[PDB]
């Protein structure tokens, strides 16, 4: 075909990137992550127990108010690195940027209070490949290019810095150039199956102390932040001097400028954040603690270890990622 369409993304903190999807008829409207670490659909279930305190703060799809449901109630768990959810599986009607799709997506009845409990959507749309589906679902942008409306099988990401101003955008079946600037650099993925590259090193300053002999990047759209395995991140960290806490990383708020650069050599380029990047500069405080938009996130295999290239990341860099050639383009996001 020759639509192009927009989702329009909220940005909540610079942590969390969201927009809304119809589910049934007629639609019920739910807050989700577009997440290309993941290929599954999924919201909240009405038949969630409410002893699950994510369910009673979080929309619940009602399959019971839907005339368009289609029932299947196959039993299925989503395993991410930071939670489980589980439920069933079902289809009905989903609208996305004004597509309309029939889709298999999971009533989520059992969601854990950490991280849901802090999270401001309600669900996720994966946005990776069948091969990661669990249950082999199709996913949702399968389904679309299969509907021959998309102008080409790609979409892309613009994840806003501001956090009266769009907090991002997913486009769907091209990109928009009022958010990128400059030519794409496109590095081919390793395998179709996931949206993961090689990654060539990873340099603190001039100093390349970090993936020196290549490792694998995920870029994750449905993170918040840049990752790494514990080991790797622990190196990173000691570098730059920052101080390890429960959940993140920190350090003295006025030595948050003064941070060294970070670069991710990708495709033959360095992709340079600097302190700015990276840093959550809340302050210039010497008595008070600055987190740093990195943390260590252990992936198993086949899929890890390897780091996650998130928001930190997709914020400086508009992302496009294209099914048709199996390649991830990156452009200077404005
Ligand atoms: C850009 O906006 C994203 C905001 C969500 C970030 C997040 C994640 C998160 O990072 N993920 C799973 C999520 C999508 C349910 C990622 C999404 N991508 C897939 C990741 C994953 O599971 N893996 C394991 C398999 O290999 C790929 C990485 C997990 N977990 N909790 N939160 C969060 C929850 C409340 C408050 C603040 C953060
Ligand atoms: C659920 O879907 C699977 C695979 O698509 C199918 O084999 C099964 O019959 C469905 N179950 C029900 C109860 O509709």
């Known amino acids: 075909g020759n639509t192009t369409s927009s989702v329009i993304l909220t940005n909540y903190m610079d942590t969390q990137?969201?927009?809304?999807?119809?589910?049934?008829?007629?639609?019920?409207?739910?807050?989700?992550?577009?997440?290309?670490?993941?290929?599954n659909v999924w919201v909240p279930s009405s038949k969630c127990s409410r002893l699950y305190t994510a369910c009673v703060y979080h929309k619940l799809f009602?399959?019971?108010?839907?005339?368009?449901?289609?029932?299947?109630?196959?039993?299925?768990?989503?395993?991410?690195?930071?939670?489980?959810?589980?439920?069933?599986?079902?289809?009905?009607?989903?609208?996305?940027?004004?597509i309309t799709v029939?889709?298999?997506?999971?009533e989520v009845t059992e969601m854990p209070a950490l991280p849901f409990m802090?999270?401001?959507?309600?669900?996720?749309?994966?946005?990776?490949?069948?091969?990661?589906?669990?249950?082999?679902?199709?996913?949702?942008?399968?389904?679309?290019?299969?509907?021959?409306?998309?102008?080409?099988?790609?979409?892309?990401?613009?994840?806003?810095?501001?956090?009266?101003?769009?907090?991002?955008?997913?486009?769907?079946?091209?990109?928009?150039?009022?958010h990128y600037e400059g030519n794409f650099h496109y590095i081919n993925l390793i395998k179709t199956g996931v949206w993961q590259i090689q990654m060539k090193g990873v340099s603190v300053g001039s100093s390349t102390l970090l993936?020196?002999?290549?490792?694998?990047?995920?870029?994750?759209?449905?993170?918040?932040?840049?990752?790494?395995?514990t080991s790797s991140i622990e190196k990173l960290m000691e570098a730059l001097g920052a101080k390890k806490r429960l959940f993140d990383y920190v350090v003295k708020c006025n030595e948050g400028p003064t941070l060294p650069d970070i670069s991710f050599h990708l495709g033959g380029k360095e992709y340079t954040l600097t302190s700015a990047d990276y840093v959550f500069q809340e302050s210039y405080s010497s008595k008070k603690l600055c987190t740093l938009?990195?943390?260590?996130?252990?992936?198993?295999?086949?899929?890890?270890?390897?780091?996650?290239?998130?928001?930190?990341?997709?914020?400086?860099?508009?992302?496009?990622?294209?099914?048709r050639n199996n390649?991830?383009?990156?452009?200077?996001?404005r």
Not at 17 to 39: A, H, L
């Open 211 to 229: 993936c020196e002999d290549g490792c694998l990047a995920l870029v994750d759209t449905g993170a918040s932040y840049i990752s790494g395995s």
């Open 62 to 98: 009602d399959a019971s108010d839907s005339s368009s449901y289609k029932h299947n109630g196959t039993e299925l768990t989503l395993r991410y690195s930071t939670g489980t959810v589980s439920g069933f599986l079902s289809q009905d009607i989903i609208t996305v940027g004004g």
């Open 118 to 178: 802090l999270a401001e959507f309600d669900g996720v749309v994966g946005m990776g490949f069948i091969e990661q589906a669990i249950g082999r679902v199709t996913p949702i942008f399968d389904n679309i290019i299969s509907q021959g409306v998309l102008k080409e099988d790609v979409f892309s990401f613009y994840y806003n810095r501001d956090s009266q101003s769009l907090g991002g955008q997913i486009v769907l079946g091209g990109s928009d150039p009022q």
């Open 102 to 106: 029939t889709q298999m997506f999971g």
């Open 17 to 39: 990137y969201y927009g809304e999807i119809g589910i049934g008829t007629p639609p019920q409207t739910f807050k989700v992550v577009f997440d290309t670490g993941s290929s």
């Open 327 to 333: 390649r991830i383009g990156f452009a200077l996001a």
């Open 293 to 323: 938009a990195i943390h260590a996130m252990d992936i198993p295999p086949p899929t890890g270890p390897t780091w996650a290239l998130g928001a930190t990341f997709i914020r400086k860099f508009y992302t496009e990622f294209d099914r």
